Ligand SMILES: [Ca+2]
């Protein structure tokens with residue numbers, strides 16, 4: 122059983138949200154929509170198919186992507202320990218948006234393949250409980 | 251001192267190439283150009299500006315591989331609901347770092363991508 126507006130699949134409840142938020146705000150927002158809520162987690166082919174189709178029902182634009190709940194915990198820009206020449210990373214000059222540690226799915230693959238995106242980007246998302 | 255076909259800077263030798271290769275092939279290629287040679291590494295802003303100017307004045311506009319690969323492969327990837335990460339469907343397996351011959355800013359793209367590159371070694 123799921124709250125009004127939420128769709129169920131294998132004992133879980135899902136809901137796509139059209140408002141654009143950063144990965145973090147989206148996650149936080151989900152925790153407040155329903156008890157135990159979080160950004161969606163895709164743990165199997167079946168779930169990926171269901172979530173992909175659910176998303177496709179509301180999102181029909183290609184100018185954005187949809188946030189899923191997988192993210193690289195590390196604060197660093199990258200997790201490599203050294204350059205190909207062995208030297209340590211003692212200097213960086215990244216363009217902020219180029220560090221893509223949050224994942225999302227895009228309409229180009231029918232919302233299936235996980236693509237790396239800049240975490241502070243604002244995009245639609247899916248909550249699961 | 252660097253061979254005639256390389257440019258020197260702070261005791262190091264650099265050389266751009268315009269034979270399009272993916273990251274792995276570029277690195278391997280660099281090692282065969284001279285002993286100690288690898289894809290360029292940046293330890294400072296001055297070195298970065300040097301190499302960028304070098305690449306532009308030689309091939310103009312283009313993207314050039316940098317010596318950083320599989321940048322997020324060893325990161326701590328976790329689902330926010332604490333679920334175990336088993337099933338996966340990555341669009342790209344690994345990301346590598348490159349720069350455009352127009353500025354010293356680091357950019358990321360899939361390591362499968364085809365691009366130019368710059369080799370470097372200690373003289
Ligand atoms: Ca799930």
Ligand SMILES: [Ca+2]
Nearest residue numbers: 290291292293
């Ligand atoms: Ca260097």
